[PDB]
Structure 1
């Protein structure tokens, strides 16, 4: 987050096929395209107002959430538009008739819509392969 001087890179980052005619003068200083990914998830005013682009965002980016809806807590947010979360769980070993703790560290893509910290509980929704490891995207946060 932190609004990051949006046009920092070399390419011009914009929403594709969103053409704001300069000939017409209006309010709505720029056209911003967004959506609602269903499942009761609230696309925030921060997304609909902000200037960030994020091709990979589910709200303003040309992707689509489908499949699994998981939950975790954040343990590493050192990357750009990406984080890692720890999905703890138990696992039954029948011989002893009891369990053992386990985990998975899962990398997930985050949008600039959300500001997040380590320890923040979140939920995530599966997307298509974003990268070599990221098959998910952030959809809601549940702490401060």
Structure 2
């Protein structure tokens, strides 16, 4: 995948306007700029400490989080650094006095700070329009996969 040794494109990925000093070699030996996105979403420990870049991450990148905060259950994650959740819900008809199921497939950017597998219950936040269809961004993952690691060791 993205696979750290992060500098894999035709340019130099960086946190912009964040300056290691080459002349001053001191007790840091690493400098990143993280921000708590707010609203009591904990920034992950992989955000502060990792080496990825992601200019559209909500913890390292320039984008920020406001507006609607939504949840959803993730479905296919074949795209690079972004996923699609399924935002399902009941519609109401007043004629028939009953309801019907409806779903939306919202695409949504994900940081490599999060490890999102298909079938996670994720929480997204609204960002600035970060691609054509993407407007949102993953802020917290609450994955419940039924302990499928040891699923083969069973009765």
Give the TM-score normalised by structure 1.
0.95
Paired residue total? 142
Q: Is the 8 A contact 1:3 1:52 kept in 2?
A: no
Larger radius of gyration: 2
- Please list every run of 5 or more consecutive structure 2 residues that lacks an aligned counterpart in the other structure: 143-155
Pair 1:130 & 2:134 matched: no
CA RMSD of aligned residues (A): 1.1
Flag structure 1 segments of 5+ consecutive residues without an equivalent. none
Pair 1:136–1:17, CA change in 2 (3 A): same
- CA contact 2:123–2:141 (8 Å) conserved in 1: yes
Name the CA distance, whole Å, in 2 between partners of 1:73 and 1:122. 6
Deviates most, 26-35 or 50-59 = 26-35
Q: Deviations over 1:46-102 (max 9, x none)?
A: 000001000000100011101000000111110111000000000000011010001
Corresponding position: 1:109 with 2:109: yes
SS of the aligned residue for 2:17 comes to coil
Runs of 4 or more, structure 1, over 4 Å off, are: none
The answer to whether the 8 Å contact 2:108/2:138 transfers is yes
